[PDB]
Amino acid sequence: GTSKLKYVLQDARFFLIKSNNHENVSLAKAKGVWSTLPVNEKKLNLAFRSARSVILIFSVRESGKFQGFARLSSESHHGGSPIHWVLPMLGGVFKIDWICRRELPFTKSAHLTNPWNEHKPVKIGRDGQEIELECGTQLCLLFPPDESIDLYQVIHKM
Ligand SMILES: CNC(=O)c1cc(NC)ccn1
């Protein structure tokens, strides 16, 4: 079903996360963590205090796909366990709960445009680009269901 998913996404905010490599998305999926540049860290912390759910939608650059999406479960914090990101300077660490670890090809989202990025297709956007509520909700609902996920515990964090 999609009903608990819709509940988690009701009045959520959505952000496009672009990773230079698959390894960082894999660490994020394994450890439930993300870290970004301070300009985006400040935006995510503001959004986390302002919305019932803040959703990060991940895309590896040059992959032509999204690799899943996740909900912020905390603001960023420093001094936790170190994360061996593959880098080419990162802020704190956000804890995240994954909502879907399955891929979605950009060919499947070509009908969705993001008003906050000049109504360009939602796949287009810099790291940290906010996706407007309706576009972001329909993008998340496009993903194949991830039957390994139970949103019951995520609902309890809202
Ligand atoms: C896990 N976080 C990253 O890989 C990242 C890298 C970056 N510049 C290379 C900017 C924001 N985030």
- Supply the CATH number for residue 120's domain: 3.10.590.10
Outline where DSSP puts E strands in the chain.
13-19, 33-34, 54-60, 65-66, 68-72, 94-100, 104-105, 113-114, 120-121, 130-131
Which of 18, 25, 35 to mutate for ligand 1's pocket (most ligand atoms within 8 Å of CB)? 35
State which residues form the domain around 75: 1-158
The strand pair at 104-105 and 33-34 is best described as unpaired
Torsion of CA 143, 133, 93, 85, to 10 degrees: 40
CA-closest residue to ligand 1 atom 5: 36
Q: Is 142 left (phi over 0), alpha (psi -120 to 50) or beta?
A: alpha
Instruction: Provide the domain count of the chain.
Output: 1
Query: Burial level of 57, CB count in 10 A (0-12/13-18/19+)?
Result: buried
Residue 94 contacts residue 75 (beta carbons within 8 Å)? yes
How would you list the strands of the sheet with 13-19, edge to edge? 33-34, 94-100, 68-72, 54-60, 13-19, 130-131
Cβ atoms 5, 71 nearer than 8 A: no
DSSP SS3 for 23:
helix
Rounded CA-CA distance 36/76 in Å is 9
Residue 114: what residue type?
N
* Measured CA distances, 57 to 15, 135, 148 (Å): 6, 12, 18
Which candidate, 58, 64, 55, 54, places its Cα nearest to that of 17? 58
Task: Supply angle C-alpha 84, 86, 92, rounded to 5.
Answer: 55
Q: How far apart are CA 137 and CA 55, in angstroms?
A: 10
Per the structure block, which two tokens stand in for 12? 């959520």
**DSSP state at residue 107:** G
Q: What is the resolution of this structure in A?
A: 1.6
Q: How far apart are CA 78 and CA 72, in angstroms?
A: 16
Among the atoms of ligand 1, which is closest to the Cα of residue 127? 11
